[PDB]
Design an enzyme around this catalytic site. Structure first.
Site, PDB file in Angstrom:
ATOM      1  N   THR B 197      69.060  22.306 -33.179  1.00 31.42           N
ATOM      2  CA  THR B 197      67.929  22.561 -32.284  1.00 31.42           C
ATOM      3  C   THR B 197      66.798  23.360 -32.879  1.00 31.42           C
ATOM      4  O   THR B 197      66.994  24.166 -33.788  1.00 31.42           O
ATOM      5  CB  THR B 197      68.339  23.250 -30.947  1.00 31.42           C
ATOM      6  OG1 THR B 197      67.191  23.306 -30.104  1.00 31.42           O
ATOM      7  CG2 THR B 197      68.838  24.656 -31.158  1.00 31.42           C
ATOM      8  N   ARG B 198      65.599  23.110 -32.374  1.00 26.95           N
ATOM      9  CA  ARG B 198      64.441  23.840 -32.840  1.00 26.95           C
ATOM     10  C   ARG B 198      63.617  24.315 -31.644  1.00 26.95           C
ATOM     11  O   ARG B 198      62.420  24.610 -31.776  1.00 26.95           O
ATOM     12  CB  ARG B 198      63.592  22.969 -33.747  1.00 26.95           C
ATOM     13  CG  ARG B 198      63.354  21.601 -33.188  1.00 26.95           C
ATOM     14  CD  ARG B 198      62.192  20.974 -33.887  1.00 26.95           C
ATOM     15  NE  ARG B 198      61.066  20.784 -32.981  1.00 26.95           N
ATOM     16  CZ  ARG B 198      61.034  19.898 -31.989  1.00 26.95           C
ATOM     17  NH1 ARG B 198      62.079  19.109 -31.775  1.00 26.95           N
ATOM     18  NH2 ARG B 198      59.961  19.797 -31.219  1.00 26.95           N
ATOM     19  N   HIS B 202      67.598  25.118 -22.716  1.00 31.19           N
ATOM     20  CA  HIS B 202      67.568  25.221 -21.269  1.00 31.19           C
ATOM     21  C   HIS B 202      68.887  24.801 -20.630  1.00 31.19           C
ATOM     22  O   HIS B 202      69.894  24.597 -21.294  1.00 31.19           O
ATOM     23  CB  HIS B 202      66.408  24.438 -20.707  1.00 31.19           C
ATOM     24  CG  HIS B 202      65.087  24.896 -21.238  1.00 31.19           C
ATOM     25  ND1 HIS B 202      64.606  26.173 -21.048  1.00 31.19           N
ATOM     26  CD2 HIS B 202      64.173  24.265 -22.012  1.00 31.19           C
ATOM     27  CE1 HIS B 202      63.454  26.306 -21.687  1.00 31.19           C
ATOM     28  NE2 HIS B 202      63.165  25.163 -22.282  1.00 31.19           N
ATOM     29  N   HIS B 205      70.618  21.688 -22.004  1.00 28.39           N
ATOM     30  CA  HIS B 205      71.365  21.853 -23.236  1.00 28.39           C
ATOM     31  C   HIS B 205      72.665  22.630 -23.150  1.00 28.39           C
ATOM     32  O   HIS B 205      73.605  22.418 -23.940  1.00 28.39           O
ATOM     33  CB  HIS B 205      70.470  22.462 -24.228  1.00 28.39           C
ATOM     34  CG  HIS B 205      69.121  21.852 -24.212  1.00 28.39           C
ATOM     35  ND1 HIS B 205      68.129  22.299 -23.383  1.00 28.39           N
ATOM     36  CD2 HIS B 205      68.591  20.834 -24.932  1.00 28.39           C
ATOM     37  CE1 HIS B 205      67.032  21.595 -23.604  1.00 28.39           C
ATOM     38  NE2 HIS B 205      67.287  20.699 -24.539  1.00 28.39           N
ATOM     39  N   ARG B 291      68.908  12.355 -27.384  1.00 32.58           N
ATOM     40  CA  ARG B 291      67.662  11.614 -27.339  1.00 32.58           C
ATOM     41  C   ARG B 291      66.650  12.213 -28.256  1.00 32.58           C
ATOM     42  O   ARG B 291      66.486  13.414 -28.299  1.00 32.58           O
ATOM     43  CB  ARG B 291      67.058  11.587 -25.929  1.00 32.58           C
ATOM     44  CG  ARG B 291      65.545  11.176 -25.892  1.00 32.58           C
ATOM     45  CD  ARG B 291      64.901  11.436 -24.529  1.00 32.58           C
ATOM     46  NE  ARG B 291      64.837  10.215 -23.750  1.00 32.58           N
ATOM     47  CZ  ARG B 291      63.837   9.338 -23.818  1.00 32.58           C
ATOM     48  NH1 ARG B 291      62.806   9.572 -24.632  1.00 32.58           N
ATOM     49  NH2 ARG B 291      63.882   8.215 -23.087  1.00 32.58           N
TER      50      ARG B 291
HETATM   51  N1  ADX Z   1      67.462  16.303 -22.436  1.00 34.42           N
HETATM   52  C1  ADX Z   1      68.274  16.113 -23.482  1.00 34.42           C
HETATM   53  N2  ADX Z   1      69.450  15.457 -23.339  1.00 34.42           N
HETATM   54  C2  ADX Z   1      70.287  15.260 -24.405  1.00 34.42           C
HETATM   55  N3  ADX Z   1      70.172  15.619 -25.678  1.00 34.42           N
HETATM   56  C3  ADX Z   1      68.959  16.291 -25.802  1.00 34.42           C
HETATM   57  C4  ADX Z   1      68.009  16.561 -24.819  1.00 34.42           C
HETATM   58  N4  ADX Z   1      66.948  17.246 -25.363  1.00 34.42           N
HETATM   59  C5  ADX Z   1      67.287  17.372 -26.620  1.00 34.42           C
HETATM   60  N5  ADX Z   1      68.476  16.834 -26.961  1.00 34.42           N
HETATM   61  C6  ADX Z   1      69.150  16.810 -28.221  1.00 34.42           C
HETATM   62  O1  ADX Z   1      69.713  18.129 -28.511  1.00 34.42           O
HETATM   63  C7  ADX Z   1      69.297  18.610 -29.817  1.00 34.42           C
HETATM   64  C8  ADX Z   1      68.152  19.549 -29.519  1.00 34.42           C
HETATM   65  O2  ADX Z   1      66.941  18.951 -29.408  1.00 34.42           O
HETATM   66  P1  ADX Z   1      65.579  19.679 -29.927  1.00 34.42           P
HETATM   67  O3  ADX Z   1      65.957  20.967 -30.572  1.00 34.42           O
HETATM   68  O4  ADX Z   1      64.506  19.619 -28.895  1.00 34.42           O
HETATM   69  O5  ADX Z   1      64.925  18.826 -31.114  1.00 34.42           O
HETATM   70  S1  ADX Z   1      65.516  18.459 -32.544  1.00 34.42           S
HETATM   71  O6  ADX Z   1      64.275  18.013 -33.228  1.00 34.42           O
HETATM   72  O7  ADX Z   1      66.165  19.616 -33.200  1.00 34.42           O
HETATM   73  O8  ADX Z   1      66.555  17.495 -32.247  1.00 34.42           O
HETATM   74  C9  ADX Z   1      69.064  17.268 -30.580  1.00 34.42           C
HETATM   75  O9  ADX Z   1      70.349  16.527 -30.834  1.00 34.42           O
HETATM   76  C10 ADX Z   1      68.309  16.501 -29.445  1.00 34.42           C
HETATM   77  O10 ADX Z   1      68.139  15.118 -29.724  1.00 34.42           O
END
Ligand code: ADX
Ligand code: ADX
Ligand code: ADX
Ligand code: ADX
Lengths: 572, 572, 96
Positions: B197-198, B202, B205, B291
């Protein structure tokens, strides 16, 4: 209202209104003199009648009779010298001499305000003024001004008005003697007690005013100074906001808030006579004088410049000549058991009284501690906190000095990361090289050029400190002069800490991976600190560290511990 | 735990630990190359095994098999090019060639980290990289970096370890593959789902993670990126603070937070494969891909770089070669009526779904509006507001430009007093002449020199804006280039407003009471704007005013109305 | 440089101050090292105490203190137990 002092309100702006265009035109032609902020306060009150009967900057005849008799040559009482000072160089360069007509200009917007007609150009005995008008203490604010800011000569002369000063703050709350009078009329008032002040108003003051109102059967005019006050008081925008939060505590339509563009001198007793005159010109029928009116406290040896109640005596000496009734008060305090306030001369030597001093208040403001409602209303305290926040949210500057490559730059970046972890504020990092590239790309390394550079760091550091940031700067800063300059500037806005990275020159030189010390050693770089230029070792730094004996990590830990002991890392 | 990718964990730091002293000494002698922040991320993960089997910056053999086959020359899967770029000038100046031994240095603390032994020194086809690795869009972050920051050549070579990078933030939460492994052990864990994650985490997650934990019967490793991420995301100190606020929402001892020094590329599908590898090296038995994993959203023409779930497909393509179990998830949402979250594809077309988008969130943060507890926990939201305050407390810059003596200086001072009256923040006034005296006392009036000067204003403005101040600057700023520079710098920290004081040159010249336009006219002052030097008129300013047709007071009123419409004067 | 703090009770304000004072004076980091094995007959159970120590951590500046539990069975031997404790902390690596 009440009649002006001397019988005629000297409203130079109303007098010369019909000649405005002409005066303006003539003003474009004469040699202009630009006023200092204090001369601009004086000019505003002269032109609008506030200093009636005075109608220009004092000439010697008038001056001398005040410097020693508290009277103007015409006989009228007037306890405060009001003069326009200039240096020999300006007097010559402009060719000023008796009968000359100079234009007085506003340094803020360059506007031509008034045309003064020189009566004389005398050189006053700053020592007799110091002593006869403001007591004699060299620590007194007025006296310090008299010597360090006031030029050598006083230029006396009557004034003709070209334009009224422009103000962009609180125009609806600012009043000229004429406007205030028309207002007292509009309101249908006839007896008005005026309250002088240069501080936020607390519970005790709301009580003085309602007491005076009740006893003299008068309406209240809260008339605070918004021009120049004692050296470190709360800014006028915070105070005005505080006076406004207080108004709702008086019964509907009983008090009126009006601002006075006076430049106080803190002349205690004399300033008090002066204030009575001014309020009378503004139309007040009564004027409050309480404990230590217009007094600037005590000097360094702890002796206080005037005694409490002396100003009440002085204003009394002229009871018969000041055409305005003084309403006296003795220290007012809080009686916890009864939950009431009254002058000390009414508390039975056995009763319990509470009081929060200036120091206690600053202590609580700085620490976030609660401030009792018996002391100051809630809305007022809130405003004061917004302006003098606790150490938890104050900005500060960490100034690092040491030889090039002493570890000061690595310590700086680690402290930055550490404080960003810590979280309270925005962190600005000013590494020596960054400053040199971003702010001083064109300076050199001459003593003057380095000093300029450190001044530039201080200018930026002060503004960031004022905005509550944590500023971390790490220039070499070889000269104590620049460092003390830095510290003085930042101290105007918040805390400044000097950390001397005393890493020994040998160590620094031996670990230089950029071969800069090398090029210095083979003369390719002239005047390099430590090789040619000197490094004035800091005498009293807040913290001394050595990258030879300690690690970045613990040097950082030592700095953090200092910020912590002083409350900067507390929770907001 | 789980076995390293390729069978051997490439812990270069553990490998060369016995030769530290020697390697250190030898490092003092070779030509050193100083790493960029991204290369430092890469170097950290190489040296600690995170990129196993990889063990140095990619040489062309390895590189090319990835640029196009997602495999390293040795056959192992690896979807992301990890190279060390340099310019011709450095390659020459340092005399770099095959077989050479360079030292890699930390620009933060100048420490010597590793010694790389050059295999080759090739010039890559940035267009094929752009297209084969990061899709092909020129707006893609990685691509933009590829062309604007990445140099011309790549320098391949194995690495030997001298020192582990130093970090002063969150050292106890940072972990090397080796440390993490020992930790999973200490805790007695055997199945571990890692969460990439970056962003702040919430409610949604927290649910993915507990779902994966329940389904794969695993423990949770919240493994956020703390190195480099998408261009404008929430800084990592705020995010770590937010992850820490979340921990208590898992049952005691179920989740562990550990930080990863990765430099994301936002390579969607490839980055996903890459992440699986990395997490495997760190010892995770499973890894979540949801996603839009590692996706940077959509371009300017509104087309999004990768499709949702594509990354799930790609990581699937190698199910048999990536030695770690992927846990997939479809967008997770909130079902109001049941008060529960679940993946969409498990939601009947009958049902209503609540969701707060990235935009809705920034809208509420910016306006101070409430953010639902079903969406994110209270402590998390609190932290997010501390970092992204409402317009009511954000700083901003008002940049004034116009001819010398166009009134911009008086407008500036009035605006200052006005905002001080207004009250919300610290006000810093940078008048043209003040800037020249305080920051550019030595610059001249050459196109380059003026441009330098405006950059200097922008540097200071940005730092003040970032600390929540209201900065007011009024230099002449004749060239659009300098102005746009200023606007871009400030915009990094907050809002920038350009106010063009379009007062006509004639008017300015005719009212000059300092005879400066005069001396320019009789050539005593060379290149004076308007007389000699040009004044590039602003094309798209936020506000245009004229001291010829409007007064200071209403110009100020027009600026104030702009700040108000955008929410800056609301109550805090 | 690590100052260790022994304890078998919840930590209140006063204790947070000792520790920061020692840290400042000995220029050391803090190791809150509470007993979790056996303590005086009627003190607060260790789960509640650990919970309390954890609630206290945020009151120190970031990264200044570390919480580590010691499986000691106190005897409440006053002076002798004190010598004993110094030995134990020394074995655990504390410099103060
Ligand atoms: N609403 C969501 N439902 C399911 N998986 C999610 C959701 N939002 C983000 N993710 C996933 O959880 C991780 C966290 O996402 P992010 O930190 O926003 O972006 S990422 O660029 O690091 O993947 C990644 O595997 C992402 O694809
Ligand atoms: N507690 C008090 N009791 C009585 N009079 C007071 C008290 N505090 C202030 N005053 C008087 O009320 C006015 C308030 O003064 P300040 O704003 O503190 O400073 S001063 O320079 O204007 O006198 C003055 O007349 C002062 O003498
Ligand atoms: N004559 C010189 N003395 C010291 N540092 C120099 C000199 N000439 C160039 N430098 C370089 O400029 C930086 C020193 O700049 P500052 O810290 O800004 O010095 S200071 O004297 O003004 O405090 C370092 O990068 C240093 O290597
Ligand atoms: N050649 C010049 N052009 C314009 N202003 C000049 C020039 N030389 C001196 N000045 C003075 O310097 C100020 C103009 O400086 P700046 O506003 O700082 O210029 S800017 O172009 O770099 O923005 C005014 O006080 C002006 O009188």
């Amino acid at each position: 209202a009440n009649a002006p002092h001397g019988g005629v309100l000297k409203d130079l702006l109303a007098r010369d209104a019909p000649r405005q265009a002409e005066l303006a035109a003539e003003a474009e032609s004469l040699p202009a003199v630009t006023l200092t902020e204090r001369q601009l306060c004086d000019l505003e009150l002269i032109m609008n009648g506030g200093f009636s009967p005075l109608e220009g900057f004092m000439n010697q005849a008038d001056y001398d009779r005040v410097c020693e008799d508290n009277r103007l040559a015409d006989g009228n009482v007037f306890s405060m010298p009001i003069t326009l000072d200039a240096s020999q160089e300006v007097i010559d360069e402009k060719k000023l001499q008796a009968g000359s007509r100079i234009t007085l200009r506003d340094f803020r917007d360059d506007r031509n305000l008034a045309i003064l007609t020189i009566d004389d150009i005398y050189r006053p005995d700053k020592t007799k003024e110091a002593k006869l008008v403001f007591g004699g203490d060299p620590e007194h604010p007025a006296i310090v001004y008299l010597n360090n800011t006031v030029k050598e000569f006083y230029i006396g002369g009557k004034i003709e008005a070209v334009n009224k000063l422009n103000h962009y703050d609180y125009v609806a709350l600012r009043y000229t003697p004429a406007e205030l009078r028309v207002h007292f009329d509009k309101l249908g008032w006839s007896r008005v007690v005026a309250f002088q002040t240069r501080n936020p108003m607390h519970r005790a003051h709301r009580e003085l005013t309602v007491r005076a109102a009740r006893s003299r059967q008068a309406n209240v005019l809260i008339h605070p100074v918004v021009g120049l006050t004692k050296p470190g008081d709360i800014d006028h925008f915070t105070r005005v906001r505080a006076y406004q939060a207080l108004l709702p505590r008086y019964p509907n339509g009983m008090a009126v808030l009006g601002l006075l563009g006076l430049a106080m001198r803190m002349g205690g007793p004399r300033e008090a006579i002066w204030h009575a005159i001014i309020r009378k010109n503004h139309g007040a029928t009564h004027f409050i004088v309480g404990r230590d009116h217009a007094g600037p406290g005590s000097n360094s040896k702890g002796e206080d410049f005037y005694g409490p109640y002396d100003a009440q005596h002085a204003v009394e000496k002229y009871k018969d000549e000041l055409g305005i009734e003084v309403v006296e008060f003795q220290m007012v305090t809080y009686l916890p058991d009864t939950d009431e306030y009254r002058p000390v001369d009414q508390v039975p030597a056995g009763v319990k009284t509470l009081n929060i001093s200036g120091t206690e208040l600053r202590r609580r403001l700085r620490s976030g501690a609660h401030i009792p409602e018996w002391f100051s209303y809630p809305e007022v305290v809130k405003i004061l906190r917004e302006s003098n926040p606790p150490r938890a949210t104050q900005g500060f500057t960490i100034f690092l000095t040491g030889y090039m490559n002493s570890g000061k730059d690595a310590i700086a970046r680690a402290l930055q990361v550490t404080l960003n972890q810590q979280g309270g504020r925005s962190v600005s990092l000013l590494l020596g090289d960054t400053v040199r590239h971003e702010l001083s790309s064109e300076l050199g390394f001459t003593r003057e050029d380095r000093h300029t550079n450190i001044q530039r760091i201080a200018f930026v550091a002060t503004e960031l400190t004022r905005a509550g940031a944590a500023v971390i700067a790490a220039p070499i800063a070889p000269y104590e002069e620049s460092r003390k300059f830095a510290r003085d500037a930042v101290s105007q806005a918040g805390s400044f800490f000097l950390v001397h990275v005393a890493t020994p020159l040998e160590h620094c030189e031996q670990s230089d991976k950029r071969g800069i010390y090398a090029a210095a050693r083979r003369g390719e770089i002239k005047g390099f600190t430590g090789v040619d230029d000197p490094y004035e070792t800091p005498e009293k730094a807040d913290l001394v560290v050595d990258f030879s004996k300690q690690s970045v990590r613990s040097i950082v830990h030592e700095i953090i511990l200092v910020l912590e002991s002083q409350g900067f890392l507390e929770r907001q």
